[PDB]
């Protein structure tokens, strides 16, 4: 299942050369003479776009697989975190798309989208994390409710 | 297009310099201008109206919410038919009629703010803007708190006063919202900026960012209705309608949280804004329905024995 | 310019002054660790990867109760690596762009 994606990465890696380049200075206009270049690590947000997409298909699988597992008992069941996982991540992989594309007409200060990603993804990495394992780091550090 | 530049220097021969774009010709040795958001005339004889942009209804930033605002639409009214020409079990008789049909109504209102949202806003439609865009918050999450206050207390409370509860909380937001209409008169919505007179929108004349207030509120409201959500996640009601409840606020939270900072920074374009203020509104309506009705309604339909 | 009969533009990357200066370099904005805006993905970061160390052995020296059965054990420490990466992700991205860095 991550087969397709380490060839998807490689392929980028030939169809991209991954170049940074200092970025040509019409961030802002040079007439007003306080004018900056962000040098940013041009990376093409198709690949970015293609990544997250394969991620996105690949929970919807997730979910659909969690829903099937309705009649789980007892502590094999996890389904319902599972799909709290789900519908956060997806919100923040949404309210992810706007900042990142939409908010980047406005030129002053576009790293504002380096933070937009890496923060979001640093908050889906704490729910996956958190809902799937705090519930089960509770138990072992606070109740011996089991041999 | 070209004027005349001025040297009476020895003779009287003149330079010739084609004007700014959006400078028209008054005078043939002077170019003239007129405000921003204006334009040239096309032989430059004088001041020119650029024309109005504003989110259309058919254009591609409106189609997706226009649709999912549709079919959120068209389904709380099956939902609410059904609850209604099919309330006779006790898991909605016992659990519903005009109480807790205030949900359905209020993500009806919900959904057809998207429909009030994508129209001409120059016009009263700001007012309605400002009203609905925090009353319809308000009646769900007013409806919410208050099954969240009666589940607390059995963890006055009566028909009549459910429903006064419920026109209380509803009362606060409209004399906020009252308030907000004072400070500032709705209508008037234009402008453009320094930069071109070639782009120009209706947007509404409401400072920006001040709706937040009126929101906040309807925060307020989360702010207590998980808060109670959760104290009362132990009690099993009929078909232990509880846990429905804490998912619903949860839910509603994880995308408040993020809806307001997204609201904040899109601001800056009307486009975006506007799209994610629709989508917000009909993702809140979609989970608040299927997250607290869809049990129920999964009941009623497919075990119509119960 | 510099020049005193026909004024030009100075090149990309290369501010102006008009002044006796001659054009001058254009300042360069990068996302440095002392800036205020790395700070938060630092701090997410770093606590997401105490998080993930912490979950790792508490597992690592309880790994033969039955709610860790019940986790499925090695796929799951799969998983809670691939989190680990994820978050170190962040670290890699406010360094410098360079060139193996925008590579990872
Ligand atoms: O998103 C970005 N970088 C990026 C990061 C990852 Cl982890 C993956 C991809 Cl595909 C791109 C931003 C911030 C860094 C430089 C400029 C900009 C870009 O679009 O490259």
Same mark, same amino acid.
């Given at each position: 299942?991550?087969?397709?994606?380490?060839?998807?990465?490689?392929?980028?890696?030939?169809?991209?050369?991954?170049?940074?380049?200092?970025?040509?200075?019409?961030?802002?206009?040079?007439?007003?003479?306080?004018?900056?270049?962000?040098?940013?690590?041009?990376?093409?947000?198709?690949?970015?776009?293609?990544?997250?997409?394969?991620?996105?298909?690949?929970?919807?699988?997730?979910?659909?697989?969690?829903?099937?597992?309705?009649?789980?008992?007892?502590?094999?069941?996890?389904?319902?975190?599972?799909?709290?996982?789900?519908?956060?991540?997806?919100?923040?992989?949404?309210?992810?798309?706007?900042?990142?594309?939409?908010?980047?007409?406005?030129?002053?200060?576009?790293?504002?989208?380096?933070?937009?990603?890496?923060?979001?993804?640093?908050?889906?990495?704490?729910?996956?994390?958190?809902?799937?394992?705090?519930?089960?780091?509770?138990?072992?550090?606070?109740?011996?409710?089991?041999? | 297009?070209?004027?005349?530049?001025?040297?009476?220097?020895?003779?009287?021969?003149?330079?010739?310099?084609?004007?700014?774009?959006?400078?028209?010709?008054?005078?043939?040795?002077?170019?003239?201008?007129?405000?921003?958001?204006?334009?040239?005339?096309?032989?430059?004889?004088?001041?020119?109206?650029?024309?109005?942009?504003?989110?259309?209804?058919?254009?591609?930033?409106?189609?997706?919410?226009?649709?999912?605002?549709?079919?959120? +639409?068209?389904?709380?009214?099956?939902?609410? &038919?059904?609850?209604?020409?099919?309330? /006779?079990?006790? %898991? =909605?008789? #016992?659990? $519903?009629?005009?109480?807790?049909?205030?949900?359905?109504?209020?993500?009806?209102?919900?959904?057809?703010?998207?429909?009030?949202?994508?129209?001409?806003?120059?016009?009263?439609?700001?007012?309605?803007?400002?009203?609905?865009?925090?009353?319809?918050?308000?009646?769900?999450?007013?409806?919410?708190?208050?099954?969240?206050?009666?589940?607390?207390?059995?963890?006055?409370?009566?028909?009549?006063?459910?429903? +006064?509860?419920?026109?209380?909380?509803?009362? &606060?937001?409209?004399?906020?919202?009252? /308030?907000?209409? %004072? =400070?500032? #008169?709705? $209508?008037?919505?234009?402008?453009?900026?320094?930069?071109?007179?070639?782009?120009?929108?209706?947007?509404?004349?409401?400072?920006?960012?001040?709706?937040?207030?009126?929101?906040?509120?309807?925060?307020?409201?989360?702010?207590?209705?998980?808060?109670?959500?959760?104290?009362?996640?132990?009690?099993?009601?009929?078909?232990?309608?509880?846990?429905?409840?804490?998912?619903?606020?949860?839910?509603?939270?994880?995308?408040?949280?993020?809806?307001?900072?997204?609201?904040?920074?899109?601001?800056?374009?009307?486009?975006?804004?506007?799209?994610?203020?629709?989508?917000?509104?009909?993702?809140?309506?979609?989970?608040?329905?299927?997250?607290?009705?869809?049990?129920?309604?999964?009941?009623?339909?497919?075990?119509?024995?119960? | 310019?510099?020049?005193?009969?026909?004024?030009?533009?100075?090149?990309?990357?290369?501010?102006?002054?008009?002044?006796?200066?001659?054009?001058?370099?254009?300042?360069?904005?990068?996302?440095?660790?002392?800036?205020?805006?790395?700070?938060?993905?630092?701090?997410?970061?770093?606590?997401?990867?105490?998080?993930?160390?912490?979950?790792?052995?508490?597992?690592?020296?309880?790994?033969?109760?039955?709610?860790?059965?019940?986790?499925?054990?090695?796929?799951?420490?799969?998983?809670?690596?691939?989190?680990?990466?994820?978050?170190?992700?962040?670290?890699?991205?406010?360094?410098?762009?360079?060139?193996?860095?925008?590579?990872?």
């Amino acid at each position: 299942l991550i087969s397709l994606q380490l060839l998807g990465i490689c392929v980028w890696f030939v169809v991209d050369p991954s170049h940074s380049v200092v970025d040509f200075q019409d961030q802002r206009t040079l007439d007003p003479r306080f004018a900056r270049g962000v040098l940013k690590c041009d990376i093409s947000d198709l690949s970015l776009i293609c990544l997250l997409g394969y991620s996105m298909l690949l929970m919807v699988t997730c979910t659909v697989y969690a829903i099937k597992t309705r009649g789980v008992p007892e502590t094999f069941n996890e389904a319902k975190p599972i799909g709290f996982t789900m519908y956060t991540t997806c919100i923040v992989w949404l309210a992810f798309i706007p900042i990142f594309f939409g908010t980047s007409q406005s030129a002053d200060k576009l790293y504002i989208q380096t933070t937009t990603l890496t923060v979001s993804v640093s908050l889906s990495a704490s729910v996956s994390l958190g809902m799937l394992y705090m519930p089960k780091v509770y138990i072992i550090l606070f109740h011996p409710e089991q041999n | 297009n070209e004027v005349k530049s001025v040297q009476p220097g020895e003779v009287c021969c003149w330079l010739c310099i084609p004007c700014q774009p959006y400078e028209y010709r008054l005078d043939e040795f002077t170019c003239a201008d007129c405000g921003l958001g204006y334009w040239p005339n096309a032989s430059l004889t004088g001041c020119f109206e650029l024309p109005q942009e504003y989110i259309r209804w058919g254009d591609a930033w409106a189609v997706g919410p226009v649709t999912i605002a549709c079919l959120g +639409a068209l389904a709380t009214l099956f939902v609410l &038919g059904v609850f209604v020409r099919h309330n /006779a079990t006790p %898991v =909605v008789k #016992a659990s $519903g009629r005009e109480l807790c049909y205030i949900l359905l109504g209020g993500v009806f209102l919900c959904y057809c703010m998207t429909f009030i949202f994508i129209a001409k806003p120059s016009t009263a439609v700001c007012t309605l803007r400002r009203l609905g865009l925090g009353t319809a918050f308000s009646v769900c999450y007013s409806a919410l708190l208050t099954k969240t206050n009666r589940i607390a207390r059995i963890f006055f409370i009566s028909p009549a006063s459910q429903v +006064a509860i419920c026109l209380a909380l509803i009362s &606060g937001q409209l004399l906020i919202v009252v /308030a907000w209409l %004072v =400070v500032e #008169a709705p $209508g008037t919505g234009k402008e453009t900026a320094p930069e071109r007179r070639e782009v120009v929108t209706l947007r509404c004349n409401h400072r920006d960012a001040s709706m937040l207030g009126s929101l906040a509120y309807n925060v307020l409201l989360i702010a207590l209705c998980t808060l109670y959500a959760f104290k009362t996640r132990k009690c099993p009601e009929n078909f232990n309608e509880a846990k429905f409840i804490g998912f619903t606020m949860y839910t509603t939270c994880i995308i408040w949280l993020a809806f307001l900072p997204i609201f904040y920074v899109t601001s800056s374009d009307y486009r975006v804004q506007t799209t994610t203020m629709c989508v917000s509104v009909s993702l809140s309506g979609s989970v608040v329905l299927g997250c607290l009705f869809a049990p129920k309604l999964h009941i009623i339909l497919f075990q119509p024995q119960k | 310019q510099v020049d005193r009969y026909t004024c030009k533009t100075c090149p990309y990357d290369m501010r102006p002054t008009e002044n006796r200066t001659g054009c001058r370099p254009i300042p360069i904005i990068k996302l440095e660790w002392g800036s205020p805006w790395a700070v938060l993905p630092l701090f997410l970061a770093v606590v997401g990867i105490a998080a993930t160390l912490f979950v790792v052995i508490t597992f690592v020296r309880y790994n033969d109760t039955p709610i860790v059965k019940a986790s499925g054990r090695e796929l799951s420490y799969v998983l809670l690596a691939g989190i680990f990466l994820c978050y170190a992700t962040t670290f890699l991205m406010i360094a410098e762009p360079d060139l193996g860095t925008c590579s990872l």
